């Protein structure tokens, strides 16, 4: 709900990619060296259907 | 409308939200929830605009 | 420069209630419940654009 609304919503499509966003719009203990990678995997590169594998994964 | 969406009520709850915030995994406490926040913008040898 | 919190959390973390909070921000209006009915302490000044 809150961050998957957030995500799509908001990310249309963001024209620069502004990655230092909704990083921010996200629960749990932050700044990771995790997470990081799991977002600049979805958005480019194979959009659209991208945008729908992440939320199921 | 700040005010309705802050989880924090009291000093203790915003203090270790800080706590939180700044320093994301050991169990905010009592002494370190306040010391840490009082060492950001309350402190000589941590805060200085000169 | 991290994650973002509702601006009023460093507030309560100086050890600010809720209702100073708002005395701090907003002018107060003040309402009378006498002789079974409503009363208002009108400003003049405020009713711009309304």
């Known amino acids: 709900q809150s961050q998957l609304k957030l995500l799509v919503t908001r990310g249309k499509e963001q024209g620069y990619l502004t990655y230092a966003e909704v990083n921010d719009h996200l629960p749990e203990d932050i700044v990771d060296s995790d997470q990081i990678e799991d977002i600049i995997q979805m958005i480019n590169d194979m959009g659209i259907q991208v945008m729908e594998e992440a939320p199921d994964a | ?50 | 420069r991290r994650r973002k919190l509702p601006a009023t959390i460093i507030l309560r973390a100086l050890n600010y209630t809720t209702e100073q909070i708002l005395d701090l921000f907003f002018e107060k209006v003040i309402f009378e419940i006498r002789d079974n009915k409503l009363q208002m302490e009108l400003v003049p000044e405020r009713l711009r654009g309304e």
């Open chain 2, 1 to 50: 409308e700040t005010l309705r969406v802050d989880p924090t009520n009291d000093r203790l709850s915003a203090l270790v939200e800080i706590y939180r915030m700044m320093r994301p995994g050991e169990p905010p406490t009592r002494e370190a929830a306040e010391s840490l926040f009082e060492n950001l913008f309350f402190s000589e040898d941590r805060y200085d605009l000169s």
